[PDB]
Amino acid sequence: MLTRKEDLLTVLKQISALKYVSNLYEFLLATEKIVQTSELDTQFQEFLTTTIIASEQNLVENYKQMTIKQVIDDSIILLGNKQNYVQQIGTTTIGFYVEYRQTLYSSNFRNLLNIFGEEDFKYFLIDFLVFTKVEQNGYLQVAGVCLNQYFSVQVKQKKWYKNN
Questions:
Q1: Known consequence of changing residue 131 to A?
Q2: Is 52 left (phi over 0), alpha (psi -120 to 50) or beta?
Q3: Cα(124)–Cα(57) distance, integer angstroms
Q4: All structural domains of the chain with their residue ranges
């Protein structure tokens, strides 16, 4: 469920498998998808700086330089048989069809789709764990391999009464 920023960050820095962690704004800058002077609404700009993303490797060079619903469906289809991605939750995939994300449909992500371009956006949701600020110091993962999949590997524990 919802997580506090400092908790998300401490968990993320502890996971050695995730070598890359940044806020979205800086990633878009490094990949040159946007530049310092790009015209950005304050809401969207606040969305870029508060959104946190993580990947196993540094994919900046890889990302250098249609409805949102459709792009997301295609993205999910690209997952193949892989499992445990946030976007797959409560989803069933059969061939090119997906049946059954509220945040991913927002204007923020639609603007993100237009800046990334169709192809890169599709892979973005796969290569990155994406955490968005839902409320005051309240983060939610909206895409990528479920964080729990990594914590579990980093900190392997058989049994416990509870560990949120």
A1: Abolished reverse transcriptase activity
A2: beta
A3: 13
A4: 1-164
